[PDB]
Amino acid sequence: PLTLEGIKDRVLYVLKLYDKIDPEKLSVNSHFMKDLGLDSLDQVEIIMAMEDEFGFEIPDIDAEKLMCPQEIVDYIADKKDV
Amino acid sequence: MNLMITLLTNFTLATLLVTIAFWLPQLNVYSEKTSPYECGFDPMGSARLPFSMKFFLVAITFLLFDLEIALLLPLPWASQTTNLNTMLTMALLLIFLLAVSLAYEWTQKGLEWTE
Amino acid sequence: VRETFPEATIIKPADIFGREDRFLNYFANIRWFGGVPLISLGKKTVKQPVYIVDVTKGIINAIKDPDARGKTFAFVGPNRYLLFDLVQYVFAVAHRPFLPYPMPHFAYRWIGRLFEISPFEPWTTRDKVERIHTTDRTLPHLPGLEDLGVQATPLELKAIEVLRRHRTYRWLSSEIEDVQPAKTV
Amino acid sequence: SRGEYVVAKLDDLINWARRSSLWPMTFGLACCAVEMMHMAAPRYDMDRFGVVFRASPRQSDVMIVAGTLTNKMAPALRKVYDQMPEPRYVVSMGSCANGGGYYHYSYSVVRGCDRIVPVDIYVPGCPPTAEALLYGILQLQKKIKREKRLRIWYRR
Amino acid sequence: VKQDMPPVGGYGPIDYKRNLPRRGLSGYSMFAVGIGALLFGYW
Amino acid sequence: MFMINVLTLIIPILLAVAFLTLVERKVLGYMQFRKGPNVVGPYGLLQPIADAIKLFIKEPLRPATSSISMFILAPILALTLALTMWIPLPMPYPLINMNLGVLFMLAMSSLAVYSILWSGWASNSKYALIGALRAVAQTISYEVTLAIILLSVLLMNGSFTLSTLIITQEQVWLIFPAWPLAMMWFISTLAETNRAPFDLTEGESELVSGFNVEYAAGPFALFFMAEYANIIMMNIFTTTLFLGAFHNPYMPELYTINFTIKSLLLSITFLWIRASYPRFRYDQLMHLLWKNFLPLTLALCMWHVSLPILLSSIPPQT
Amino acid sequence: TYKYVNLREPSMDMKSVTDRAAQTLLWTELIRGLGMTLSYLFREPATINYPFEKGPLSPRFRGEHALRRYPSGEERCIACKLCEAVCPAQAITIEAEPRADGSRRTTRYDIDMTKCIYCGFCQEACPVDAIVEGPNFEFSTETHEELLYNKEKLLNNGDKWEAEIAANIQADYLYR
Amino acid sequence: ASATRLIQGLRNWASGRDLQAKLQLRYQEISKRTQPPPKLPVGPSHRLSNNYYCA
Amino acid sequence: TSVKPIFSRDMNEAKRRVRELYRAWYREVPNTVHLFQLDISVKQGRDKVREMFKKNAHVTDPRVVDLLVIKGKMELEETINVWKQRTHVMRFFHETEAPRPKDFLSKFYVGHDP
């Protein structure tokens, strides 16, 4: 909520907490489905880990369109002020 | 002295009817015989949840009518006084005020329960 | 048994823990006696406890396998432990107070004849003292649970299943993800 | 020996105490609950034998499984039996509790209550009459009478 | 034929109604007994 | 030689409880058209020995979830307060002849609730919690008459001494001046000791067994022989209040036999009520001792305050 | 042709109001209930003395099964499988072949006494009255497989209880 | 019906009814357990003539 | 080919409902391990829920996955309200069953099954 860089750092920290994500291949502009090779269920539990960290309810129509950490940190910048 | 001997005897052979009920039978305990009893199935939550007393106003008013039976209780002694009309007036005054309290709890729906 | 029956499948389970055992039920039922006595704080003897379903599946696969005739199997668990951090893990799964003390050989074999003065089922004895404070020897040449198609299940995945019985009430609603696993050796 | 006679008389006393005041638990499931209540009724009358209901499983000795054991009440029956203090006994009343009964091939019937609990006395019938159930309870008393608990403990 | 049949004159009539015999005193009699017991005890 | 005097008091009122179980089962049998126990001994005389030996050799079953200290302390205090309420009861000379033994009886009636209460709290189950707060709802109803009725019956006595209560009734029974207080004290003692139609704590069909649903054999037995000792004590207390017999100081055995048989007839009366009546809903208990018994109790309290003043029959305090 | 239970409007005169208030204060119906209980206190109870007395029955009673015989020693069962066909629980298993004199007889005649519902279709389907459901109900066992009767236990029950089953069928076969 | 007249009168008073005329315990008034042999009648179509089943 | 739908018009809303049901089970699994006092871990439970979702992974029929959503909601309601017991949750973890043959040679060895 203070800096966008701290939010992006917390996003990448939550993403490297999860087991199936390779921390090398993970980037700001990595695609979850076609680059990392994730199912939908992996992406949805990623978004619920984001809900557990940041502490707000993320609906489904705007978590359908979270295919990269760029859009993740941008949508979290949408839900807050920064 | 004899009262303490009696109370100590009662407590002694009331706790020696307990400890001979544990060490005498055979204890084969495993972690299903010690689970709570909810008529055969698993309990829903714990048993330490707040069991809401609907009878709470009567539960308080028991105290204020139990102080009454600390005030009304010296009447077998107060019959022995040489100032007897005042004693009669004060005793009937206390039961009259107790009954006015009971009637105010009656008519304002206090002896009934909530919900 | 080996010399009078030349094909007797001899099986060596190392130390078996389970529900009706005398291994974790012994380590958990010295809590209100006075403080879990050991010799030199129990950091001198080494154990590897084997799980009872693994031993039973080993006995099944010993019945099934004709190759397993006449062998001498040594069933051991996958993780070796000191006794001290084993008893740390026992009193840390049960969420119990823990103040161990050294009781030397001057009087810890005499607490047998002090503590089986009853003719009933004994709580401890001097053989139990000499076996709990005996390390588990390593015999790599013998075939084990790996050589009968059994995945050996370690202590931490079943110790909560064993020792949920001893928690009072205040941490019965606890988890396996609360206690950190004991140090291996 | 002398102590052999001592533990023999102690076994006689405690086996008599256990067979003389068996307390069944209020457990019926099906048609056999009616006939078990007839075994409590004033004709056949369990209560003359020291056989009196305690509804709590904590304070009972014999569990008369009187009825049919479906799938939905198999863990309930197992937890009820597990919450009975040792020594506890089980009388399997009626054919459904014995071996599956008239609904043996059904999709949701546990084929006999010996798959779930250990069973001591099998009382056959559909329903067994209250006299036959009383015969099963008296045969359970004859079974408890020839227990040898302290004799085997002295001889182990 | 010999069969389970009712007898020659049929059966007797069977009562199927209530019969509560109306015992006890009246209310005035019961309060008179009670208040007389009060007065004898008081005397 | 006072310890022998205590033992010869509290051992026979542990044997009389065991045989009250047999009298209970047999009177409950014959009043329900069946028989009671008659197989164990000669016409039932050995079934109490079977119930005594069988319970104290069965597994005790301390539950896991139960707070164990209060769970063990509750039947100890139950049997202690079942024993200690026998000592001021004049038989015709009591064990401990207190000056104010009526208040000792009433106060130990007040303290005996906490055994049931800690048993229903400590034995960590939901049925036990319901049985404990139904004991609260029962006790807040009977303690608000158990003092005024016991008070207004003593306004013809003068003092709170139970040994004086034979001198009070040396001419007439005290049931004749206070029969509404008698027939209301009788229901107050029914609703006190959890007997039917006011079971309500061992409510066997609303709950399973209520507060003692978790007590397996051994600890359960010290509520069993507590409740039956309390009802024998309570029949003897109602007998000494309202039916106190003739006392010859040269022959105490006439009085002893007479209040023995009166207490037996009132215990048979308790068994004869339990074998006859439906059980109350426990608000109806509360709407009885508050809405029905209590205004007439206050009215008779006014009557028995005013009446010895009205008649110059104020009793001596000595 | 219908009646109204509990449609009694009570009288409101001072006599009956005083009577109902006396019933309320002085508890008349409570003394009535206690009097009815006391009247049952002084009766002879209906508790029969089992096992020295026995519960009353009829000759039609359906108890333990048995295979009967002719009055020549020959077993009646001619292996015709009607009893396992009409068996609603399918407790009967029948396997047959000709024996050493060529007669049509069974080799396996099992009645699973824990599937069996004791309804007596086999005693009425049997054309030769071979299988019967006799008088015995006190055959409770300590183990489950002792309630799985083969042909041998049923023939031994027939030899055991023939002296009673013959008289029961003799008294009853005119109704059938 | 073996109770003596004092218990019988006390029981009739406490019940408030007349009990010895209507006893629930059975005595010699019941049928005998050994019955005469029956001869049941036949159905109405047990006839050797006009027994065509289609009718 | 024109039949009445259940709750979903096409596959997108059906995937949304399957996705929200998987959200509900992902939230549910720690409570189910906690209050039933099981012996399993949240990793093992969530991987078993992943296996139960991927067991039906071949369906392209919207009505079928709608009924699977509804029956998953029934499983969820029987799990939140304590109507399942410990045994009804542990029926998914087939632990007492012996390991079954998979290859051809062991199925040839044990019986006549194809």
Ligand SMILES: CCCCCCCCCCCCCCCCCC(=O)OC[C@H](COP(=O)([O-])OCC[N+](C)(C)C)OC(=O)CCCCCCCCCCCCCCCCC
């Ligand atoms: C002491 C030893 C024993 C003595 C003998 C005892 C024998 C009877 C035993 C009965 C056992 C019954 C078991 C429990 C029964 C519980 C139900 C019940 O009855 O509830 C009580 C019932 C309850 O009534 P209710 O519940 O039916 O009323 C309904 C009330 N509303 C409408 C509000 C819902 O009655 C009472 O409360 C009355 C108490 C006793 C009354 C006594 C009156 C005495 C006379 C006073 C004077 C009158 C004249 C006027 C003034 C004259 C002045 C000089």
Ligand SMILES: CCCCCCCCCCCCCCCCCC(=O)OC[C@H](COP(=O)(O)OCCN)OC(=O)CCCCCCCCCCCCCCCCC
């Ligand atoms: C050194 C020498 C002493 C050694 C140690 C002795 C310890 C105590 C021994 C007590 C007696 C033990 C023997 C028990 C009976 C053995 C014989 C037997 O089987 O008797 C059965 C018989 C009834 O037969 P049953 O089959 O039940 O009847 C069906 C109806 N026809 O049963 C009967 O007829 C009645 C049986 C009664 C048993 C005795 C009475 C009870 C025990 C009293 C003493 C102990 C009590 C301790 C305190 C308890 C509380 C008071």
Ligand SMILES: CCCCCCCCCCCCCCCCCC(=O)OC[C@H](COP(=O)(O)OCCN)OC(=O)CCCCCCCCCCCCCCCCC
């Ligand atoms: C003030 C008085 C207070 C009294 C309170 C108690 C009242 C009731 C007392 C009991 C009443 C009688 C009970 C009789 C029981 C049956 C006795 C009997 O015959 O038992 C037989 C049984 C087996 O013996 P067996 O050898 O098989 O016999 C076959 C014969 N060829 O053998 C056995 O079981 C072994 C022997 C058992 C003996 C038991 C005796 C009764 C014990 C009861 C406790 C009270 C003791 C006395 C107290 C008062 C006197 C001090």
Ligand SMILES: CCCCCCCCCCCCCCCCCC(=O)OC[C@H](COP(=O)(O)OCCN)OC(=O)CCCCCCCCCCCCCCCCC
């Ligand atoms: C972990 C929890 C605790 C566990 C331990 C539990 C211990 C036992 C609990 C049960 C007993 C509770 C007793 C409560 C006090 C009772 C007082 C009493 O009995 O008073 C009555 C009586 C009054 O009569 P009075 O007018 O004095 O007549 C004498 C003239 N000759 O008095 C007399 O006649 C006077 C005779 C001498 C009195 C001595 C002092 C009284 C005894 C106090 C003992 C301690 C009580 C502890 C209570 C704990 C409750 C849990």
Ligand code: SF4
């Ligand atoms: S065995 Fe038969 S008659 Fe008996 S309870 Fe079962 S279904 Fe009913």
Ligand code: SF4
């Ligand atoms: S009685 Fe009925 S269920 Fe039993 S074997 Fe005969 S036909 Fe089958």
Ligand code: SF4
């Ligand atoms: S028992 Fe009767 S019906 Fe059954 S096969 Fe034999 S002859 Fe036929």
